[PDB]
Amino acid sequence: QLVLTQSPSASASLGASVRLTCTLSSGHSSYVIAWHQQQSEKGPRYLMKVNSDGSHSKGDGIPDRFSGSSSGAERYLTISSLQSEDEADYYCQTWGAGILVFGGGTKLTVLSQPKAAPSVTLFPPSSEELQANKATLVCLISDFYPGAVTVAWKADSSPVKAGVETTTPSKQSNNKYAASSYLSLTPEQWKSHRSYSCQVTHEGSTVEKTVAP
């Protein structure tokens, strides 16, 4: 029965155009396909419909730089004047005899944006947590682009591996990325070193914040 397939990733440059492809399996070459966008950490948003005709409608508030078309078993979404906001996932979708079908989604990267270095804020354990006989260091990392970082912790100058939990990067509403890292310690471990450090490596450069008991 009806299957929609999408390439897992696509890219194009800021201000340029990109075309995303959704391929219908054989046997349904006459079905309407809809495109839905999904930003990091948000629900999907409907963009537009495309019928096997090349015509298209559009959703509320969708800019004119989004359009759709078709050729054979392929259905297309074209985004012109690419912006940082367009870095997101794109799913195609259709309907056939009570059954709904989704493609696997295409992750679009918008190339040619400026590198943006992370802003790092590091908090020591609170007085309240220490009185509860626990200790958490909180390393908050924001506003970086592209969206990949590595986080390393130091106790004085030695690497720490135990007790580290770090999130995956997620896109902010300002189209830069955020991540966080937590180091769990006993109050004794915290008080027994001169300092602890959170080291964030982004695009070949490492920045550090340090706290001390």
User: Is residue 31 a contact point for other proteins (CB under 8 A)?
Assistant: no
DSSP per-residue codes, 149-199: -EEEEEETTEEE-TTEEEPPPEE-TTSSEEEEEEEEE-HHHHHTSS-EEEE
Single-letter residue type at 3? V
The C-alpha atoms of residue 61 and residue 131 are separated, in whole angstroms, by: 52
Q: Is 209 in the site for other proteins (CB under 8 A)?
A: no
Nearer to other proteins, 14 or 84 (CB): 84
Q: Using CB under 8 A, which residues numbered 182 to 201 contact other proteins?
A: 182
Binding residue count for other proteins, defined by CB under 8 A: 44
| 170 near other proteins, judged by CB under 8 A | yes
Quick check: bond before 146 cis, omega within 30?
A: yes
Minimum CB separation of residue 100 from other proteins in Å reads: 4
CB of 169 to other proteins, least distance (A): 9
Cα–Cα dist 106/86, whole Å: 12
Q: Does 55 bind other proteins (CB under 8 A)?
A: no
Question: 182 and 139 in contact (C-beta within 8 Å)?
Answer: yes
Chosen residue from 2, 3, 138, 155 binding other proteins by CB under 8 A: 138
Smallest separation, CB 186 to other proteins (Å) = 15
Tell me the β-bridge partners of 101.
Answer: 94
How far apart are alpha carbons 173 and 87 in whole angstroms? 11
CB-based contact 91:27 (threshold 8 Å): no
Residue 61 as a binder of other proteins (CB under 8 A): the answer is no
Q: Does 166 bind other proteins (CB under 8 A)?
A: yes
Q: Does 3 bind other proteins (CB under 8 A)?
A: no
d(CA 135, CA 152): 18
Nearer to other proteins (CB atom), residue 16 or residue 132: 132
Q: Which positions lie near other proteins, rule CB under 8 A? A: 34, 36, 38, 41, 43-46, 49, 57, 59-60, 91, 93, 95, 98-105, 121, 123-124, 126-129, 132, 136, 138, 140, 142, 165-167, 170, 172, 178, 180-182
